[model samples]
Target: AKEMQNVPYTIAVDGIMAFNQSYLNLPKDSQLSYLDLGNKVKALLYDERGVTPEKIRNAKSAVYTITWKDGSKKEVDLKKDSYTANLFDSNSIKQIDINVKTK
Candidate 1:
């Protein structure tokens, strides 16, 4: 059996909503190719996690420690996200953590 390795990592979903919205705002006729979308997704992921592109690509599972304004912690699975499969393969995500901040 292969041993499991856990690496502490965090993902911020903060700007994704806005980013998706902007993408949707683009003209229907606009040719937003997969490369374009991937670039946009890459940029968002880069901003959320302070990891290099290569590191992100090689990451097994990206952890997200969400810090809300109410001081609470919730762990979320990046694999569950709709975009996960599109952005990465089955091995890309290991886990996720959502840490809520206290007001």
Candidate 2:
């Protein structure tokens, strides 16, 4: 099996918290798209951990396999589809699974 790779420690923690805050900040029952959420996270992260818009935008090698609320699944490309899934409503998302290629 391919082992999970490690992102930079600071980035890993900061990214999680930043993403969480962005999610928490959403209005109740409101839906926000991924790339937008990602941009919010990037904004929250600021210069912390060397998080650059270029880094976030270029962080496209990983594919997020999304599990929707209705049990539908889809592959999301960061470069194409942006990031994460919807926030609320019947079409809201349930889970996200990720796998990235490494040299």
Candidate 3:
């Protein structure tokens, strides 16, 4: 079996404006360079929806499982078109659950 150590990393998610920007901001020079910006966005989501990076990295479909204030669970698939919202909209995103996997 071939080792998957050098596989290219690509993010699969809904077409969100913020995510788009974040993706664009990714360093073209180095793959690991985006950690700073990624962390910033992660922090923003964490403060707003209590979602963590680990949650996204371990998701199955890159969908965020949002727990609403009403105690209801909603799954937001990043592969949809509704992800195009302002990044600063705390109330817009209940939670961000993205499935980060090595392909």
Best-matching candidate per lDDT: 2
Q: Which ten residues in a row have the lowest lDDT in candidate 2?
A: 1-10
Better of 1 and 3 by TM-score: 1
By lDDT, the better pick of 1 and 2 is 2
CA-lDDT, candidates in order? 0.36, 0.44, 0.37
The residue-by-residue lDDT of candidate 2 on 1-89, one tens digit each, is: 12222211112432243233112233334455666644543454445445444554556353446566677877755445444556533
Quote the positional error of residue 59 for candidate 3 in Å.
Answer: 1.4
**Candidate 1 global CA lDDT score:** 0.36
Steric collisions counted per model: 17, 0, 5
Tens digit of per-residue lDDT, candidate 1, span 28-66:
222233344344445546565444555543446543443
Return the lDDT, model 3, position 36.
Answer: 40
Error of 1 at 52 (Å): 1.9
State the lDDT at 14 in candidate 2.
20
lDDT of 3 by residue, 1-103 (tens): 1222211212333332233322212222232322343454455555544555565655454443544335566554433323232232223223333333222
**TM-score of structure candidate 3:** 0.27
- Regions of candidate 1 where Cα sits further than 4 Å from its true position: 1-25, 61-103
- Pairs with steric clashes in candidate 2: none
At residue 88, what lDDT does model 1 achieve?
A: 24
